[PDB]
Design a protein around this ligand. Structure first.
Ligand SMILES: C1CCCC(Nc2nnc(C3CC3)o2)CC1
Length: 149
């Protein structure tokens, strides 16, 4: 699995996080991130992917130790945590061919799991447009509690 890098951008209240909506298999909402290039350092890949997807440069804000990393299906995803970005920042992807929309979401309102279908006695999970973000939500809330209060 080629590792991916990106960011969790939060506003100044720490309430809201910046998600991006793709197309097709990436049609839902997720954190801005993408695959590392040959010989590219993690921090540079995170900044490149975030600038390509949001038009916002995190380079001067990345902290080396402040990230959440998950291994999903034997692919590693690491999102640098970037707090205090004002909600009135103008975000604009580099190309609309990959990114449909960019929005702030309330962290407390986001799901941290998908819903089963126990009502229908059917196995599996109900669709959720936050599926790409979900795995990071509980680890984020725990990280924020520890590092802030
Ligand atoms: C569109 C822009 C690129 C970021 C993307 N984030 C994402 N999180 N998981 C995946 C799947 C590959 C496993 O993608 C979704 C939004």
């Amino acid at each position: 699995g080629v590792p991916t890098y990106g960011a969790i951008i939060l506003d100044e209240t720490l309430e809201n996080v910046l998600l991006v909506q793709g197309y097709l298999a990436k049609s839902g909402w997720g954190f801005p991130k993408g695959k590392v290039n040959k010989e590219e350092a993690p921090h540079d890949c995170a900044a490149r992917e975030v600038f390509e997807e949001t038009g916002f440069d995190i380079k001067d804000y990345i902290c080396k130790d402040d990230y959440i990393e998950l291994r999903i299906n034997d692919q590693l995803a690491r999102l640098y945590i970037i707090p205090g970005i004002p909600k009135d920042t103008k975000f604009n992807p580099k190309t609309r061919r990959e990114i449909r929309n960019i929005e702030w979401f309330s962290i407390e309102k986001l799901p941290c799991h998908r819903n089963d279908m126990t009502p229908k006695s059917k196995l599996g999970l109900a669709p959720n447009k936050f599926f790409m973000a979900i795995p990071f939500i509980r680890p984020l809330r725990d990280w924020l509690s520890r590092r802030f209060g």
